Coordinates of C-alpha atoms in Angstrom, one line a residue:
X1 CA 248.9 34.6 50.8
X2 CA 252.2 36.2 51.9
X3 CA 251.4 39.7 50.3
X4 CA 248.1 40.8 51.8
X5 CA 249.3 40.4 55.5
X6 CA 252.4 42.1 54.5
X7 CA 250.6 44.9 52.9
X8 CA 248.6 45.5 56.1
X9 CA 251.5 45.1 58.5
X10 CA 253.9 47.3 56.8
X11 CA 251.5 50.2 57.1
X12 CA 250.7 48.9 60.7
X13 CA 254.3 49.4 61.5
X14 CA 254.1 53.2 61.1
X15 CA 250.8 54.5 62.7
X16 CA 248.7 55.6 59.6
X17 CA 245.0 55.5 58.6
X18 CA 243.9 52.5 56.4
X19 CA 240.7 53.8 55.1
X20 CA 242.0 53.7 51.5
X21 CA 241.2 50.4 49.8
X22 CA 243.8 47.7 49.7
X23 CA 244.5 44.4 47.9
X24 CA 245.4 46.1 44.5
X25 CA 246.4 42.8 43.0
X26 CA 249.8 44.2 41.9
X27 CA 253.0 44.2 43.8
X28 CA 253.7 47.4 45.7
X29 CA 257.3 48.2 46.3
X30 CA 258.6 45.9 48.9
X31 CA 261.9 44.5 50.1
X32 CA 262.8 40.9 51.2
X33 CA 264.6 41.6 54.5
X34 CA 262.1 44.4 55.7
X35 CA 259.0 42.2 55.6
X36 CA 261.1 39.3 56.9
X37 CA 262.1 41.2 59.9
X38 CA 258.7 42.6 60.5
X39 CA 257.3 39.1 60.5
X40 CA 259.9 37.9 62.8
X41 CA 259.4 40.7 65.3
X42 CA 255.7 40.6 65.7
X43 CA 255.3 36.9 66.0
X44 CA 256.7 36.5 69.6
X45 CA 259.2 33.8 68.8
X46 CA 262.8 34.7 69.5
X47 CA 264.2 31.8 67.3
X48 CA 261.4 30.9 64.9
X49 CA 261.7 28.4 61.9
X50 CA 260.6 29.1 58.5
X51 CA 257.5 27.0 59.0
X52 CA 256.5 29.0 61.9
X53 CA 256.6 32.2 59.9
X54 CA 254.8 30.5 57.1
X55 CA 252.1 29.5 59.4
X56 CA 251.7 32.9 60.8
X57 CA 251.5 34.2 57.3
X58 CA 248.8 31.9 56.3
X59 CA 246.9 32.5 59.5
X60 CA 246.9 36.3 58.9
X61 CA 246.0 35.8 55.3
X62 CA 242.9 33.6 56.2
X63 CA 241.9 36.1 58.9
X64 CA 242.3 39.2 56.7
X65 CA 240.4 37.2 54.0
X66 CA 237.6 36.5 56.4
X67 CA 237.5 40.3 57.4
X68 CA 237.0 41.3 53.6
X69 CA 234.5 38.5 53.2
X70 CA 232.3 40.4 55.7
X71 CA 230.9 43.8 55.0
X72 CA 232.8 45.6 58.0
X73 CA 234.8 48.0 55.6
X74 CA 231.6 48.8 53.6
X75 CA 229.6 49.6 56.8
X76 CA 232.5 51.7 58.0
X77 CA 232.3 53.6 54.8
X78 CA 228.7 54.1 55.0
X79 CA 228.4 54.8 58.5
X80 CA 231.6 57.2 58.5
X81 CA 232.4 56.5 62.2
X82 CA 233.9 53.1 62.5
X83 CA 237.6 53.4 61.9
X84 CA 240.5 52.3 64.3
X85 CA 238.5 49.1 64.4
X86 CA 241.1 47.4 62.2
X87 CA 243.9 48.5 64.8
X88 CA 242.0 46.2 67.4
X89 CA 241.5 43.6 64.7
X90 CA 245.2 43.4 64.0
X91 CA 246.2 43.3 67.6
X92 CA 243.8 40.5 68.3
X93 CA 245.3 38.6 65.4
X94 CA 248.5 38.9 67.0
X95 CA 247.1 37.6 70.2
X96 CA 245.5 34.5 68.5
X97 CA 248.6 33.8 66.5
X98 CA 250.5 33.8 69.9
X99 CA 247.8 31.4 71.2
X100 CA 248.3 29.4 68.0
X101 CA 251.7 28.8 66.7
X102 CA 254.5 29.8 69.0
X103 CA 255.6 26.7 71.0
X104 CA 258.2 27.2 73.8
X105 CA 264.6 14.5 80.3
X106 CA 267.4 15.8 78.1
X107 CA 266.2 13.7 75.1
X108 CA 262.5 14.4 75.4
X109 CA 263.2 18.2 75.8
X110 CA 261.9 18.9 72.4
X111 CA 258.9 16.6 72.5
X112 CA 257.8 16.0 76.1
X113 CA 258.3 19.6 77.4
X114 CA 255.2 21.2 76.4
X115 CA 255.3 24.9 77.5
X116 CA 251.4 25.3 76.9
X117 CA 248.5 23.2 77.6
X118 CA 244.6 23.7 77.4
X119 CA 244.9 25.3 80.9
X120 CA 245.7 28.6 79.0
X121 CA 243.4 31.4 77.5
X122 CA 241.8 30.8 74.2
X123 CA 240.4 34.1 73.0
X124 CA 238.7 33.1 69.7
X125 CA 237.0 35.6 67.4
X126 CA 235.9 34.7 64.0
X127 CA 234.3 36.7 61.0
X128 CA 231.9 34.2 59.6
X129 CA 231.8 33.5 55.9
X130 CA 228.1 32.7 55.7
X131 CA 226.9 35.7 57.5
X132 CA 228.1 39.3 58.0
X133 CA 228.7 39.2 61.9
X134 CA 231.5 38.2 64.3
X135 CA 231.6 35.6 67.0
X136 CA 233.5 35.5 70.2
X137 CA 234.3 32.3 72.4
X138 CA 236.7 31.8 75.2
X139 CA 237.2 35.2 76.7
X140 CA 235.5 38.2 78.4
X141 CA 236.0 41.9 78.1
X142 CA 236.1 44.3 81.0
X143 CA 236.5 48.1 80.9
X144 CA 239.6 49.7 82.6
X145 CA 240.4 53.0 84.4
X146 CA 242.3 54.5 81.3
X147 CA 239.3 54.4 79.0
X148 CA 240.3 51.3 77.2
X149 CA 239.0 47.7 77.4
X150 CA 241.1 44.7 78.6
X151 CA 240.7 40.9 78.3
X152 CA 240.0 38.6 81.2
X153 CA 239.7 34.8 81.2
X154 CA 237.3 32.4 83.1
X155 CA 238.1 30.8 86.5
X156 CA 240.9 33.4 86.9
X157 CA 241.9 36.8 86.0
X158 CA 244.4 38.3 83.4
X159 CA 245.4 41.6 82.0
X160 CA 246.6 40.6 78.4
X161 CA 246.4 43.4 75.6
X162 CA 246.2 46.5 77.5
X163 CA 245.5 49.8 75.4
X164 CA 243.5 48.2 72.4
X165 CA 241.1 50.8 71.1
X166 CA 238.8 53.8 72.0
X167 CA 234.9 53.6 72.8
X168 CA 233.6 54.8 69.4
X169 CA 234.3 51.2 68.1
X170 CA 232.5 49.7 71.1
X171 CA 229.4 52.1 70.4
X172 CA 229.4 51.2 66.8
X173 CA 229.3 47.6 67.5
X174 CA 226.7 47.8 70.2
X175 CA 224.6 49.6 67.6
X176 CA 225.3 46.6 65.3
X177 CA 224.3 44.3 68.1
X178 CA 227.1 41.7 67.9
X179 CA 227.3 39.3 70.9
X180 CA 230.1 40.5 73.0
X181 CA 231.0 38.8 76.2
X182 CA 228.5 35.8 75.9
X183 CA 229.1 33.3 78.6
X184 CA 228.6 29.8 77.1
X185 CA 228.4 27.9 80.5
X186 CA 224.8 29.0 81.0
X187 CA 223.4 28.8 77.5
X188 CA 220.9 26.3 76.1
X189 CA 221.6 23.7 73.5
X190 CA 219.8 25.4 70.8
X191 CA 221.6 28.8 71.0
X192 CA 225.0 27.1 71.3
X193 CA 224.3 25.0 68.4
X194 CA 223.2 28.0 66.4
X195 CA 226.3 29.9 67.3
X196 CA 228.7 27.0 66.4
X197 CA 226.9 26.6 63.0
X198 CA 227.2 30.4 62.5
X199 CA 230.7 30.1 63.2
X200 CA 231.6 27.2 61.0
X201 CA 229.8 28.8 58.1
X202 CA 227.2 26.0 58.3
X203 CA 223.7 26.7 56.9
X204 CA 220.4 25.1 58.2
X205 CA 221.7 23.9 61.5
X206 CA 220.4 20.3 62.2
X207 CA 221.3 18.4 65.3
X208 CA 223.1 15.2 64.4
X209 CA 223.3 13.8 67.9
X210 CA 221.7 15.6 71.1
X211 CA 223.7 13.5 73.4
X212 CA 226.8 15.3 72.4
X213 CA 227.2 17.9 75.2
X214 CA 229.1 20.8 73.9
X215 CA 231.0 22.9 76.4
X216 CA 233.0 26.0 76.1
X217 CA 236.3 24.1 75.6
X218 CA 234.3 22.1 73.0
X219 CA 233.8 25.4 71.1
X220 CA 237.4 26.2 71.5
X221 CA 238.9 23.0 70.1
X222 CA 236.3 22.4 67.5
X223 CA 236.7 25.9 66.1
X224 CA 240.5 25.7 66.4
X225 CA 240.5 22.6 64.3
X226 CA 238.1 24.1 61.7
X227 CA 240.3 27.3 61.5
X228 CA 243.6 25.3 61.4
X229 CA 242.4 23.4 58.2
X230 CA 240.8 26.5 56.7
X231 CA 243.8 28.6 57.0
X232 CA 246.0 25.6 55.6
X233 CA 248.1 25.0 58.8
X234 CA 248.7 21.2 59.2
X235 CA 246.2 19.8 61.9
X236 CA 248.1 17.7 64.5
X237 CA 246.3 17.2 67.6
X238 CA 248.5 16.5 70.6
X239 CA 246.0 15.0 72.9
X240 CA 246.2 11.8 74.9
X241 CA 244.0 8.9 73.9
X242 CA 242.1 10.0 77.0
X243 CA 240.9 13.1 75.5
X244 CA 237.9 12.7 73.2
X245 CA 239.3 13.4 69.6
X246 CA 237.5 11.0 67.3
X247 CA 234.1 11.9 68.4
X248 CA 235.1 15.5 68.1
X249 CA 235.8 15.7 64.4
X250 CA 233.2 13.1 63.7
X251 CA 230.7 15.6 65.2
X252 CA 232.5 18.4 63.1
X253 CA 232.0 16.5 59.9
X254 CA 228.4 15.5 60.8
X255 CA 227.6 19.2 61.1
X256 CA 229.6 20.0 58.0
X257 CA 227.8 17.5 55.8
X258 CA 224.3 18.6 57.2
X259 CA 221.9 16.0 55.8
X260 CA 223.7 13.9 53.2
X261 CA 224.4 10.4 53.7
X262 CA 227.6 9.9 51.8
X263 CA 231.1 9.0 53.5
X264 CA 232.6 12.4 54.7
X265 CA 234.9 11.0 57.5
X266 CA 237.5 8.6 56.8
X267 CA 238.9 7.1 60.0
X268 CA 242.5 5.7 59.2
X269 CA 244.0 3.9 62.2
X270 CA 247.7 4.6 62.2
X271 CA 249.9 2.0 64.0
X272 CA 253.3 0.7 64.2
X273 CA 252.9 -1.6 61.1
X274 CA 251.9 1.2 59.0
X275 CA 254.3 0.9 56.1
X276 CA 254.4 4.0 53.9
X277 CA 252.7 2.3 51.0
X278 CA 249.5 1.8 53.3
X279 CA 249.5 5.6 53.9
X280 CA 249.8 6.6 50.2
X281 CA 247.1 4.1 49.2
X282 CA 244.8 5.3 51.8
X283 CA 245.4 9.1 51.1
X284 CA 245.1 8.4 47.3
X285 CA 241.7 6.5 47.8
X286 CA 240.4 9.1 50.0
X287 CA 241.5 11.8 47.6
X288 CA 239.7 10.2 44.8
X289 CA 236.7 10.1 47.2
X290 CA 237.4 13.8 47.8
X291 CA 237.0 14.4 44.0
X292 CA 233.7 12.6 44.1
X293 CA 232.3 14.4 47.0
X294 CA 233.4 17.9 45.9
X295 CA 232.3 17.3 42.4
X296 CA 228.9 15.9 43.4
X297 CA 227.9 17.9 46.5
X298 CA 230.2 20.9 46.8
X299 CA 231.0 19.1 50.0
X300 CA 234.5 18.6 51.7
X301 CA 235.6 15.3 53.2
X302 CA 238.1 14.8 56.1
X303 CA 240.7 12.1 56.3
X304 CA 241.4 11.5 60.2
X305 CA 244.5 9.7 61.2
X306 CA 244.3 8.0 64.8
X307 CA 247.4 7.9 66.8
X308 CA 249.6 9.1 63.9
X309 CA 252.8 8.7 65.9
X310 CA 253.4 5.0 66.6
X311 CA 254.3 4.4 62.9
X312 CA 257.9 4.8 61.4
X313 CA 256.2 6.7 58.7
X314 CA 255.4 9.9 60.7
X315 CA 257.5 11.7 57.9
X316 CA 254.9 10.3 55.5
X317 CA 252.3 11.7 57.8
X318 CA 254.1 15.0 57.6
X319 CA 254.7 15.4 53.9
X320 CA 251.0 14.9 52.9
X321 CA 250.1 18.3 54.6
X322 CA 253.3 20.2 55.6
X323 CA 254.6 20.4 51.9
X324 CA 251.5 18.9 50.1
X325 CA 253.1 15.7 48.5
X326 CA 252.2 12.0 48.8
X327 CA 255.0 9.6 47.7
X328 CA 256.7 12.4 45.7
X329 CA 253.8 13.7 43.5
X330 CA 252.4 17.2 44.2
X331 CA 248.9 16.9 45.8
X332 CA 246.3 19.2 44.2
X333 CA 245.5 22.2 46.1
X334 CA 242.2 22.5 44.3
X335 CA 241.1 18.8 45.0
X336 CA 239.6 19.6 48.6
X337 CA 240.4 17.4 51.4
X338 CA 241.2 18.1 55.2
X339 CA 243.7 15.7 56.4
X340 CA 244.1 15.8 60.2
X341 CA 246.2 13.6 62.5
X342 CA 246.2 12.9 66.2
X343 CA 249.6 12.5 67.8
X344 CA 250.1 11.0 71.1
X345 CA 252.1 12.8 73.8
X346 CA 255.5 12.0 75.1
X347 CA 256.2 11.2 78.8
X348 CA 258.1 8.7 80.8
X349 CA 256.3 6.2 83.2
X350 CA 256.7 7.0 86.8
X351 CA 259.7 5.4 88.2
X352 CA 258.0 3.0 90.4
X353 CA 255.8 1.9 87.5

């Protein structure tokens, strides 16, 4: 997980071609401090933790794994004019990592002060695992006067990521007919559902509930959640009780299961009275249910914690997924279970209130 992004970014540091195959499964020469510094500099954070670097590492790992899952490298080999694409890839991965995991009264400074909201760009590109294409939601591309293409956002304008790549990649992908710059504010329900099921790696798209209007921001948040618990990053959703959260991942799980009538979404209401024993019991029972579902259907269940902040056991809600442990026993990485939690924001009342 820490190796492959290191192998790519070490060669990305000094501008060099990468047409030679990578992932040799053996450790090439590498030193601790050089890779540590390289991960530090390209992350954006000036004072990052170790968890943030781990999160960036797993995100790059999962993104490169998606890249090798598709046949883009093989198509580059067989078409013989597709290189330099990986440079645009890696630049965009830095961009979405900066969109993902670089956060930032005198006592709510760490908690209430939220430097980033949903009123920020979400340029989202995924290499789907079920198919051999790529999909884009949440951003637009526009050509510039220096021969390159810049990224712009809806409702405003922005000049992020100047000087990305040349025109040969654009010509190649236009030959491959991949949906670049598709605006989802004027697309019908069937096509948006097809794109969503293409992105989540879901086969045989079936409508679970037509009444669930699925906006562009809904693409962004659903795919962010799925990406978060695909790459292994803990899923904590800092949305107010106003925002629709339970319905969101209920819809996600309903699509994920497809047509089975088993129990795939376990909704645990977290609450002030949630003693730690409550949490371990619920997680263990849902973990046995996860064994059953994975063994019988090759299907992944989800354990969703509602308002997982009012309890005094938020550390219990943290250990189950940050370091993969429940009540002091190492949870099984093979088991198969997506544990997500929804944490309420922090803000004082208005003084008159």
